[PDB]
Design an enzyme around this catalytic site. Structure first.
Site, mmCIF file in Angstrom:
data_model
loop_
_atom_site.group_PDB
_atom_site.id
_atom_site.type_symbol
_atom_site.label_atom_id
_atom_site.label_comp_id
_atom_site.label_asym_id
_atom_site.label_seq_id
_atom_site.Cartn_x
_atom_site.Cartn_y
_atom_site.Cartn_z
ATOM 1 N NE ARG A 158 -3.407 2.693 2.494
ATOM 2 C CZ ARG A 158 -3.421 3.513 3.541
ATOM 3 N NH1 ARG A 158 -2.926 3.116 4.707
ATOM 4 N NH2 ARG A 158 -3.942 4.730 3.425
ATOM 5 C CG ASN B 80 -5.596 3.687 8.243
ATOM 6 O OD1 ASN B 80 -5.761 2.771 7.428
ATOM 7 N ND2 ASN B 80 -4.989 4.829 7.920
ATOM 8 C CE1 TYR C 251 -2.474 3.877 12.658
ATOM 9 C CE2 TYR C 251 -0.515 2.676 13.353
ATOM 10 C CZ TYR C 251 -1.216 3.369 12.385
ATOM 11 O OH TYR C 251 -0.652 3.531 11.136
ATOM 12 C CD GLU D 163 -4.942 7.853 9.691
ATOM 13 O OE1 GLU D 163 -4.399 8.922 10.064
ATOM 14 O OE2 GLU D 163 -4.651 6.732 10.163
ATOM 15 C CG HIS E 242 -1.329 8.998 3.143
ATOM 16 N ND1 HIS E 242 -1.451 7.645 3.360
ATOM 17 C CD2 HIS E 242 -0.967 9.540 4.332
ATOM 18 C CE1 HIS E 242 -1.188 7.378 4.627
ATOM 19 N NE2 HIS E 242 -0.885 8.509 5.238
ATOM 20 C CD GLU F 94 -2.050 4.055 7.992
ATOM 21 O OE1 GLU F 94 -1.894 4.478 9.158
ATOM 22 O OE2 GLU F 94 -2.088 4.801 6.979
#
Length: 477
Positions: A93, A316, A318, A184, A138, A384
């Site tokens: 990616r 994404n 985390y 995002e 991005h 991600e």
């Protein structure tokens, strides 16, 4: 107690994972973005982006660094592609730099040197059997659009993005079969236009501009999907989606208002962007609280979005938080607090280098199940997931390479991704952030997210870390 509840959550999915725990057709990849790795910022007739302008202002970036060179992927991509193949990943990616294609963003004269670079990158990937997954946006808006029309605050940005998307599909879609429109959008709206710590650094109209910027990002995504489906998908046969970040929201107690607050926390992160596309309007929790500052879609826009939502969702992810109701006005409108400490003093997870990144593996499984239930079981990619080490320039290279904590992070989150598949989520693949250490936005180079170390002291040499070799063994099965 909640401490016991979360301990049982972690014990139910031990941090052990093997390739056989995932479907044979599952796609494993690594992820980067153009500004964070490419360098060559003024080469090949590339125009400046808002991040070129932002990093050239002293004080915006923690370590005073910029992405002028970054890790020089612009000149070294053939060796970086070799490394992806050797580690065993099946997909990569990456993002395309808009200002390499249309240096002023106006969409009228394609820059052939920029096309040539991405064509050679794509052809090199396919020679090695690596599938390209391409992010169109991005965060590197051409600075001419920011200066000339106000960037994402101006509705015309939707049409400039359409021209850019179209050029990418036309030039690369014979070989690129997975497209991600935006990365995002939450960060671009809030960090870019509410508090101003990300380019374009605006904090002058925080009650207004974040919502204009999200409005136009949503419409820009739908426009790219519409272009792809109507002009290119029939002959090219690929798929188009978007990548949205979500910090999981777990109620801090069994109180009903904490569950309502956690649902609201997800509404303001995910629903802000996905609910217009899937239901035809913003989440009611946002409408109720924000009133006239949240723009309204026309009926024609609602019909357009409903017909152009996505082929897949890219998550994404985390970290996670406990959420308590509490009666950045974006954050204040959510009427809640984010909690990492249980009442017995323990944390819900160990913190990585980023102050916000707590390792909470069960949270990725919660997020995946939430998305699948809310949005009618769509194909989902984790686009991600990863964690960073701290290096202000004085950290030992050998400490950065022996990244046992990163290995544990990937083992524990991947075990939960595997379990979410068993739960019934249609997960199609997983991308580690990141292939290599790179420029982490306002943190500069101080946060190392790579599976591969990059020596900023000596020639930007690549050195695979323990986590790279773990992935190599994991992917061989």
């Amino acid at each position: 107690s909640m401490a016991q509840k979360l301990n049982l959550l972690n014990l139910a999915v031990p941090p052990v994972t093997h390739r056989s725990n995932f479907p044979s057709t599952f796609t494993f990849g690594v992820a980067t973005s153009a500004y964070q790795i490419e360098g060559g910022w003024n080469e090949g007739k590339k125009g400046p982006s808002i991040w070129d302008k932002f990093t050239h202002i002293e004080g915006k970036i923690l370590d005073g660094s910029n992405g002028d060179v970054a890790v020089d992927h612009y000149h070294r991509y053939k060796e970086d592609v070799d490394l992806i193949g050797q580690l065993g990943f099946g997909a990569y990616r990456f993002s395309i730099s808009w200002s390499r294609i249309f240096p002023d963003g106006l969409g009228t004269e394609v820059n052939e040197e920029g096309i040539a670079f991405y064509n050679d990158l794509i052809n090199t990937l396919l020679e090695k059997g690596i599938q390209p997954y391409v992010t169109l946006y991005h965060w590197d808006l051409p600075s001419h659009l920011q200066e000339a029309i106000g960037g994402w605050t101006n509705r015309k940005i939707v049409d400039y993005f359409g021209l850019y998307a179209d050029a990418c599909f036309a030039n690369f879609g014979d070989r690129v079969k997975h497209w991600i429109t935006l990365n995002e959008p939450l960060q671009t709206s809030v960090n870019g236009h509410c508090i101003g710590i990300f380019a374009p650094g605006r904090n002058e109209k925080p009650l207004i501009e974040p919502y204009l910027v999200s409005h136009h990002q949503v419409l820009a995504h739908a426009t790219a999907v519409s272009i792809y489906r109507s002009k290119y998908k029939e002959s090219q046969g690929g798929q188009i989606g978007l990548s949205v970040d979500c910090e999981w929201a777990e109620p801090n107690s069994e109180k009903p208002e904490d569950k309502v607050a956690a649902d609201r926390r997800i509404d303001f992160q995910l629903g802000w962007f996905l609910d217009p596309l899937f239901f035809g309007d913003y989440p009611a929790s946002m409408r109720q609280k924000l009133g006239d500052n949240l723009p309204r879609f026309t009926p024609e826009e609602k019909e357009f979005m409903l017909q152009n939502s996505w082929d897949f969702l890219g998550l994404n992810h985390y970290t996670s938080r406990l959420i308590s109701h509490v009666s950045s006005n974006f954050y204040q409108a959510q009427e809640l607090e984010r909690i990492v400490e249980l009442e017995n003093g323990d944390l819900i997870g160990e913190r990585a280098a980023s102050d916000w990144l707590y390792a909470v593996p069960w949270g990725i499984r919660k997020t995946l199940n939430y998305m699948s239930k809310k949005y009618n079981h769509p194909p989902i990619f984790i686009t991600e997931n990863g964690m960073d080490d701290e290096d202000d320039g004085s950290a030992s290279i050998h400490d950065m390479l022996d990244d046992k904590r990163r290995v544990d992070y990937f083992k524990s989150y991947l075990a939960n991704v595997s379990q979410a598949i068993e739960d019934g989520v249609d997960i199609k693949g997983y991308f580690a952030w990141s292939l290599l250490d790179n420029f982490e936005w306002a943190q500069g180079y101080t946060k190392r997210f790579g599976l591969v170390y990059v020596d900023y002291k000596n020639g930007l040499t690549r050195h695979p870390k323990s986590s790279a070799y773990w992935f190599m063994k994991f992917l061989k099965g």
